RNA sequence: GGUACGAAGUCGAAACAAGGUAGUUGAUGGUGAACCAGUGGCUGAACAAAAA
RNA sequence: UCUUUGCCUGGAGGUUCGUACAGUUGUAGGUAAAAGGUAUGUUAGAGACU
RNA sequence: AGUCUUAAACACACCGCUCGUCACGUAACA
């Protein structure tokens, strides 16, 4: 049962309408086409530790790991522009406080929900990536990569 | 008179996309000069209210300061030599109102014709 | 129910539902929307909708359209022109049939023929438009997203870049109506492959869906749903160079899909539609609807040649004469203006690709000017005969004039619709239509010209101001904006320093007059009442 | 500048220099290369030269 | 000594509103006159006439 | 986690949560003030020191940080940290001209260029 | 009679925090000095405070 | 964003129809901080519990 | 006794803070 308030208004989602998501993969296959050619390229896949269907290593490069005393907004992932070139983050909403002046691409997956409701992701992240079902990225990618 | 001063809250909007607007026949006209230097993408007259489109560059949109000179209590009247003076140096837009209709401030010097100085768009000092 | 189910509809589609037509409720200035033609302010780009009551594009909506054409492809912000309509389930009817009656009663009444002025300063500003759209130096993407009807579709194919998509047809049908194709449209159709086009005009075959891509009319297949995502990245445009602006564009181009209806049926037009003369070719129809029906392959061409022959019969004879002289003239010089260069079959096909690609290396690059030279020559033959024989056909065809009536009362509805006995079939030179004309005062070497021909129709005296000559010529359009002060009129290209302005005032003077709807409508009204009077 | 000439679509040029932002010209249709196994065809195609308005050319 | 330039037709097919249409084509016939009609001495007319003239009328080009 | 810094020669923290990116070499710092607070404890009194630096570019950039410290020089440190983290871009002229003056409010203040 | 400033003595513990057993206010009464009793209004009001 | 009414300028102070009607902040001897408030600490015969 | 919550005109922080009558002296509106 619910005794709560019943919604009237139903807002419309657009960034994440069918027909949207033919040129958001088009312009995105360009840009790593052209990275992959270049020799010597490396790749961050930035996650969460609820995501138990992706495997994870021990440790992490470019970790910085800080006390509480002078912590104003500190930036973990500050030299984290020098050995990788290209940032996958999965959870766009808690990472947002430290790549909002981040120097690599964002490659971003969010879901339409998060969007409407927190639309301040759209500035950190520069790629915009679809996400079919929006239920849990940890499951969502693994079925893209795995396709027939 | 006053329906004219009542379109600046309306169209100094960021985060909207079209605005209403009470119709007027005086308020159709300055649309019309605001449309040919690209500050307003479109407007429709809706019956009592017109619907005014809002354009945007990068995010922030393209009008982002609008100054009231001429106020329903008062009238401003700037002869052809004075006008150059207050506005000498900048981009700013002013409407001036001119017998033969209604024209631009730059329009107003060219014919040495003495206007009346309604409102001012991305106007600084 | 399940979400797996054939016959599943999800309630939250049906409730996002939104009007096409209604996306286009802003324009430009003018609450009341009225306008011919309208304009959107945009960042990087052109916006053009035509809207109008019932699609007819008389004279006053030729004079707007040139107007924001020009003025948008001036501008180098502007690197590209968008095209769209407004109509529902109707498209650009290009001059319709209403405009065309009152030239043949005036031009008629008197007894010799002289053309009025009203009468040509219409038919020539088709062709300035028509030629506009060819030679324009940036990309013009333009959808039909309603229905063609009769000669209207001049300003889709004749687009740099043409599209389509299922909500589209093609009709044309001149020889119903016993009219010549205007605006240029013998081009397109003398390009198609093969003999297709002479079928698709004689008996105006319908067309619609993927057939129009395939066929070769149009060369893209964007949807609708394409045109106003567009407007909202548009600030990205400008950042990367000249060639990777085109790059971009082509993300929207879809596939097309395998279907076809006309994929065996080709042969048989071209072996059949192939004679030089009208008159030799009935044989050949009627020799076939006679023909021994045996297996299964002689079943269909039995029956096909029995059904052409009925509409055939229901036309204008002396229409389809001169519409099948013009086509075909046309199409032979595209045999000798190659040939002679000395060009192979293998060659030709590399060189029509490079329309559908924009070329990146060098050798790729220069076919491309192959295409654009033939090209701009082709349509200036085509259109220069054109005119020739529109103006002819007028002053000596009497018949026209109850074909257009015919038409224009039945699409109220049917039961005005009669149909008429046009004229018996005669033989003709099908030369005289297609003899140049001349307005030159010298003389002396015993009437060299003497007006259009030795004794055809000749020209009002009031036609000697604006056009010299009655020929379709080609005008000198600049290609950067002008400028008042002496500081930027240095940087207009042409510039010339013997007088330091960028422009012919006597020049300019003349072109203003022409493209003037005001000054058209008073010259209008003073005919009228003379032709209503006495 | 280069702000308000996106925007406005109008000359927003400056007093000293002339038509630096607005002016492009074509680089990519009047320099187009040429190559002389392909320009034979295009001789008795094109119009003919005939016209006088370079002499530094 | 002067130099009249000269002064392009209104647009017949202008997109403005008919309001802002009618003035404008009114003004481009007074602009054509004011610099083809040089002015007289100051003393001609009274002060008055003067003020008028000036919020009614363009400005001459030949005082 | 060091940078050569060839004309003086001498070991200089690299990362120190800074972007090693961004080159230290072409920076310039400001001091404006440094005030004093005070606290208030069970036995006694406790003062700390602050300070407001800002740093950026001198051709197109521009930052204030502001942090505090227990004493005026380590103060000055802080604060400066803050404003590198903290860089924005301007939209400047490429002409070095301005097109109309800004004006500029938060309380009393006015700033007018 | 009343008021200002400087110095400073005696007689009292009114305000702060529910101890003066809440405390400012409009109009009266009363008392060597904090001001006190009653009615109206306010919070610039403390403690305490529900299932079948 | 626009029309019109009303009101204030740090705190602060005054002799020891005619005894009626009307009307009132302001001409000083003196002073340089009255005061809204986010946070910390302390006090509390003010509430609760290892 | 050690914490938590709330209030406060004190923060050399309750040995805090602050008011009134009377006594003496110097003055401006008398």
Same mark, same amino acid.
Request: aromatic share 10%; charged share 20%; proline share 6%.
């Given at each position: 049962?619910?005794?709560?308030? =019943?919604?009237?208004?139903?807002?419309?989602?657009?960034?994440?309408?069918?027909?949207?998501?033919?040129?958001?993969?088009?312009?995105?296959?360009?840009?790593?086409?052209?990275?992959?050619?270049?020799?010597?390229?490396?790749?961050?896949?930035?996650?969460?530790?609820?995501?138990?269907? =992706?495997?994870?290593?021990?440790?992490?490069?470019?970790?910085?790991?800080?006390?509480?005393?002078?912590?104003?907004?500190?930036?973990?992932?500050?030299?984290?522009?020098?050995?990788?070139?290209?940032?996958?983050?999965?959870?766009?909403?808690?990472?947002?406080?430290?790549?909002?002046? =981040?120097?690599?691409?964002?490659?971003?997956?969010?879901?339409?929900?998060? =969007?409407?409701?927190?639309?301040?992701?759209?500035?950190?992240?520069?790629?915009?990536?679809?996400?079919?079902?929006?239920?849990?990225?940890?499951?969502?990618?693994?079925?893209?990569?795995?396709?027939? | 008179?006053?329906?004219?001063?009542?379109?600046?809250?309306?169209?100094?909007?960021?985060?909207?996309?079209?605005?209403?607007?009470?119709?007027?026949?005086?308020?159709?006209?300055?649309?019309?000069?605001?449309?040919?230097?690209?500050?307003?993408?479109?407007?429709?007259?809706?019956?009592?209210?017109?619907?005014?489109?809002?354009?945007?560059?990068?995010?922030?949109?393209?009008?982002?300061?609008?100054?009231?000179?001429?106020?329903?209590?008062?009238?401003?009247?700037?002869?052809?030599?004075?006008?150059?003076?207050?506005?000498?140096?900048?981009?700013?837009?002013?409407?001036?109102?001119?017998?033969?209709?209604?024209?631009?401030?730059?329009?107003?010097?060219?014919?040495?014709?003495?206007?009346?100085?309604?409102?001012?768009?991305?106007?600084?000092? | 129910?399940?979400?797996?189910?054939?016959?599943?509809?999800?309630?939250?589609?049906?409730?996002?539902?939104?009007?096409?037509?209604?996306?286009?409720?802003?324009?430009?200035?003018?609450?009341?929307?009225?306008?011919?033609?309208?304009?959107?302010?945009?960042?990087?780009?052109?916006?053009?909708?035509?809207?109008?009551?019932?699609?007819?594009?008389?004279?006053?909506?030729?004079?707007?359209?040139?107007?924001?054409?020009?003025?948008?492809?001036?501008?180098?912000?502007?690197?590209?022109?968008?095209?769209?309509?407004?109509?529902?389930?109707?498209?650009?009817?290009?001059?319709?049939?209403?405009?065309?009656?009152?030239?043949?009663?005036?031009?008629?009444?008197?007894?010799?023929?002289?053309?009025?002025?009203?009468?040509?300063?219409?038919?020539?500003?088709?062709?300035?438009?028509?030629?506009?759209?060819?030679?324009?130096?940036?990309?013009?993407?333009?959808?039909?997203?309603?229905?063609?009807?009769?000669?209207?579709?001049?300003?889709?194919?004749?687009?740099?870049?043409?599209?389509?998509?299922?909500?589209?047809?093609?009709?044309?049908?001149?020889?119903?109506?016993?009219?010549?194709?205007?605006?240029?449209?013998?081009?397109?159709?003398?390009?198609?492959?093969?003999?297709?086009?002479?079928?698709?005009?004689?008996?105006?075959?319908?067309?619609?869906?993927?057939?129009?891509?395939?066929?070769?009319?149009?060369?893209?297949?964007?949807?609708?749903?394409?045109?106003?995502?567009?407007?909202?990245?548009?600030?990205?445009?400008?950042?990367?160079?000249?060639?990777?602006?085109?790059?971009?564009?082509?993300?929207?181009?879809?596939?097309?899909?395998?279907?076809?209806?006309?994929?065996?049926?080709?042969?048989?037009?071209?072996?059949?539609?192939?004679?030089?003369?009208?008159?030799?070719?009935?044989?050949?129809?009627?020799?076939?609807?006679?023909?021994?029906?045996?297996?299964?392959?002689?079943?269909?061409?039995?029956?096909?040649?029995?059904?052409?022959?009925?509409?055939?019969?229901?036309?204008?004879?002396?229409?389809?004469?001169?519409?099948?002289?013009?086509?075909?003239?046309?199409?032979?010089?595209?045999?000798?203006?190659?040939?002679?260069?000395?060009?192979?079959?293998?060659?030709?096909?590399?060189?029509?690709?490079?329309?559908?690609?924009?070329?990146?290396?060098?050798?790729?690059?220069?076919?491309?000017?192959?295409?654009?030279?033939?090209?701009?020559?082709?349509?200036?033959?085509?259109?220069?005969?054109?005119?020739?024989?529109?103006?002819?056909?007028?002053?000596?065809?009497?018949?026209?004039?109850?074909?257009?009536?015919?038409?224009?009362?039945?699409?109220?509805?049917?039961?005005?619709?009669?149909?008429?006995?046009?004229?018996?079939?005669?033989?003709?030179?099908?030369?005289?239509?297609?003899?140049?004309?001349?307005?030159?005062?010298?003389?002396?070497?015993?009437?060299?010209?003497?007006?259009?021909?030795?004794?055809?129709?000749?020209?009002?005296?009031?036609?000697?101001?604006?056009?010299?000559?009655?020929?379709?010529?080609?005008?000198?359009?600049?290609?950067?904006?002008?400028?008042?002060?002496?500081?930027?009129?240095?940087?207009?290209?042409?510039?010339?320093?013997?007088?330091?302005?960028?422009?012919?005032?006597?020049?300019?003077?003349?072109?203003?007059?022409?493209?003037?709807?005001?000054?058209?409508?008073?010259?209008?009204?003073?005919?009228?009442?003379?032709?209503?009077?006495? | 500048?280069?702000?308000?000439?996106?925007?406005?679509?109008?000359?927003?040029?400056?007093?000293?220099?002339?038509?630096?932002?607005?002016?492009?010209?074509?680089?990519?249709?009047?320099?187009?290369?040429?190559?002389?196994?392909?320009?034979?065809?295009?001789?008795?195609?094109?119009?003919?030269?005939?016209?006088?308005?370079?002499?530094?050319? | 000594?002067?130099?009249?330039?000269?002064?392009?037709?209104?647009?017949?097919?202008?997109?403005?509103?008919?309001?802002?249409?009618?003035?404008?084509?009114?003004?481009?016939?007074?602009?054509?006159?004011?610099?083809?009609?040089?002015?007289?001495?100051?003393?001609?007319?009274?002060?008055?006439?003067?003020?008028?003239?000036?919020?009614?009328?363009?400005?001459?080009?030949?005082? | 986690?060091? @940078?050569?810094?060839?004309?003086?020669?001498?070991?200089?923290?690299?990362?120190?949560?800074?972007?090693?990116?961004?080159?230290?070499?072409?920076?310039?710092?400001?001091?404006?003030?440094? &005030?004093?607070?005070?606290?208030?404890?069970?036995?006694?009194? @406790?003062?700390?020191?602050?300070?407001?630096?800002? @740093?950026?570019?001198?051709?197109?950039?521009?930052?204030?940080?502001?942090?505090?410290?227990?004493?005026?020089?380590?103060?000055?440190?802080?604060?400066?940290?803050?404003?590198?983290?903290?860089?924005?871009?301007?939209?400047?002229? @490429?002409?070095?001209?301005?097109?109309?003056?800004?004006?500029?409010?938060?309380? &009393?203040?006015?700033?007018?260029?």
């Amino acid at each position: 049962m619910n005794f709560n308030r =019943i919604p009237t208004r139903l807002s419309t989602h657009y960034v994440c309408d069918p027909y949207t998501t033919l040129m958001h993969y088009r312009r995105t296959f360009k840009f790593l086409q052209a990275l992959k050619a270049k020799p010597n390229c490396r790749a961050l896949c930035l996650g969460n530790k609820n995501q138990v269907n =992706i495997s994870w290593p021990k440790h992490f490069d470019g970790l910085t790991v800080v006390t509480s005393a002078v912590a104003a907004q500190s930036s973990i992932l500050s030299s984290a522009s020098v050995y990788y070139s290209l940032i996958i983050c999965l959870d766009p909403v808690l990472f947002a406080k430290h790549l909002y002046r =981040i120097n690599v691409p964002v490659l971003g997956v969010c879901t339409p929900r998060e =969007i409407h409701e927190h639309p301040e992701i759209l500035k950190v992240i520069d790629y915009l990536l679809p996400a079919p079902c929006s239920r849990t990225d940890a499951a969502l990618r693994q079925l893209l990569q795995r396709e027939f | 008179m006053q329906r004219a001063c009542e379109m600046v809250v309306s169209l100094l909007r960021v985060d909207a996309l079209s605005q209403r607007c009470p119709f007027h026949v005086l308020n159709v006209q300055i649309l019309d000069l605001l449309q040919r230097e690209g500050l307003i993408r479109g407007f429709k007259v809706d019956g009592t209210k017109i619907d005014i489109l809002l354009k945007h560059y990068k995010g922030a949109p393209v009008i982002r300061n609008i100054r009231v000179v001429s106020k329903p209590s008062r009238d401003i009247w700037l002869t052809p030599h004075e006008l150059k003076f207050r506005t000498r140096f900048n981009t700013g837009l002013w409407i001036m109102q001119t017998s033969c209709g209604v024209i631009s401030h730059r329009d107003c010097l060219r014919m040495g014709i003495g206007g009346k100085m309604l409102m001012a768009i991305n106007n600084g000092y | 129910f399940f979400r797996t189910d054939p016959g599943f509809i999800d309630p939250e589609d049906v409730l996002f539902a939104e009007d096409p037509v209604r996306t286009w409720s802003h324009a430009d200035g003018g609450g009341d929307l009225a306008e011919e033609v309208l304009e959107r302010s945009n960042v990087g780009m052109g916006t053009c909708i035509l809207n109008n009551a019932s699609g007819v594009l008389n004279m006053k909506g030729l004079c707007g359209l040139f107007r924001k054409l020009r003025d948008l492809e001036v501008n180098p912000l502007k690197r590209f022109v968008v095209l769209t309509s407004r109509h529902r389930h109707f498209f650009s009817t290009g001059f319709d049939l209403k405009e065309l009656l009152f030239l043949a009663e005036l031009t008629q009444k008197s007894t010799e023929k002289t053309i009025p002025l009203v009468a040509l300063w219409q038919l020539r500003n088709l062709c300035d438009v028509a030629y506009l759209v060819h030679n324009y130096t940036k990309p013009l993407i333009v959808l039909m997203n309603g229905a063609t009807a009769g000669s209207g579709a001049s300003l889709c194919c004749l687009a740099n870049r043409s599209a389509a998509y299922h909500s589209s047809s093609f009709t044309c049908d001149p020889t119903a109506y016993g009219w010549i194709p205007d605006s240029g449209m013998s081009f397109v159709l003398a390009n198609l492959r093969g003999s297709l086009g002479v079928f698709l005009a004689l008996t105006g075959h319908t067309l619609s869906g993927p057939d129009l891509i395939w066929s070769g009319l149009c060369k893209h297949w964007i949807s609708p749903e394409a045109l106003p995502f567009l407007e909202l990245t548009a600030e990205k445009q400008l950042e990367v160079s000249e060639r990777e602006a085109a790059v971009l564009l082509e993300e929207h181009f879809l596939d097309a899909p395998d279907a076809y209806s006309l994929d065996d049926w080709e042969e048989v037009i071209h072996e059949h539609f192939d004679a030089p003369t009208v008159a030799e070719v009935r044989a050949r129809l009627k020799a076939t609807a006679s023909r021994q029906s045996t297996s299964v392959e002689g079943q269909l061409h039995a029956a096909w040649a029995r059904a052409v022959l009925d509409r055939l019969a229901r036309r204008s004879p002396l229409a389809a004469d001169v519409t099948f002289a013009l086509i075909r003239t046309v199409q032979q010089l595209k045999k000798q203006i190659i040939q002679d260069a000395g060009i192979f079959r293998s060659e030709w096909h590399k060189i029509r690709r490079t329309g559908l690609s924009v070329p990146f290396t060098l050798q790729g690059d220069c076919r491309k000017q192959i295409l654009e030279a033939v090209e701009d020559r082709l349509v200036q033959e085509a259109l220069q005969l054109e005119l020739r024989a529109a103006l002819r056909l007028l002053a000596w065809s009497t018949d026209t004039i109850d074909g257009l009536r015919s038409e224009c009362a039945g699409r109220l509805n049917p039961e005005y619709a009669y149909r008429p006995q046009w004229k018996q079939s005669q033989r003709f030179h099908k030369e005289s239509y297609l003899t140049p004309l001349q307005d030159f005062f010298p003389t002396i070497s015993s009437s060299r010209d003497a007006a259009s021909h030795r004794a055809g129709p000749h020209i009002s005296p009031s036609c000697a101001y604006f056009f010299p000559t009655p020929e379709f010529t080609v005008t000198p359009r600049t290609f950067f904006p002008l400028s008042a002060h002496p500081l930027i009129r240095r940087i207009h290209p042409d510039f010339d320093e013997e007088t330091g302005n960028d422009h012919n005032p006597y020049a300019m003077h003349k072109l203003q007059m022409q493209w003037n709807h005001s000054l058209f409508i008073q010259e209008r009204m003073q005919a009228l009442r003379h032709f209503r009077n006495v | 500048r280069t702000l308000a000439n996106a925007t406005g679509q109008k000359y927003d040029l400056l007093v000293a220099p002339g038509e630096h932002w607005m002016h492009w010209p074509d680089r990519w249709f009047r320099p187009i290369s040429t190559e002389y196994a392909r320009m034979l065809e295009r001789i008795k195609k094109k119009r003919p030269p005939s016209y006088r308005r370079g002499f530094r050319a | 000594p002067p130099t009249p330039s000269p002064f392009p037709l209104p647009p017949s097919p202008s997109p403005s509103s008919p309001a802002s249409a009618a003035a404008a084509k009114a003004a481009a016939f007074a602009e054509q006159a004011a610099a083809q009609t040089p002015e007289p001495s100051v003393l001609v007319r009274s002060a008055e006439e003067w003020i008028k003239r000036d919020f009614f009328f363009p400005l001459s080009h030949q005082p | 986690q060091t @940078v050569y810094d060839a004309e003086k020669g001498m070991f200089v923290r690299e990362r120190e949560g800074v972007d090693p990116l961004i080159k230290l070499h072409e920076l310039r710092q400001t001091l404006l003030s440094v &005030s004093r607070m005070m606290s208030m404890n069970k036995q006694g009194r @406790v003062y700390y020191f602050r300070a407001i630096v800002a @740093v950026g570019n001198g051709r197109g950039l521009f930052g204030i940080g502001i942090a505090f410290g227990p004493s005026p020089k380590e103060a000055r440190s802080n604060a400066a940290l803050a404003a590198i983290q903290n860089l924005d871009h301007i939209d400047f002229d @490429v002409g070095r001209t301005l097109t109309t003056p800004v004006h500029g409010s938060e309380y &009393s203040a006015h700033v007018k260029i």
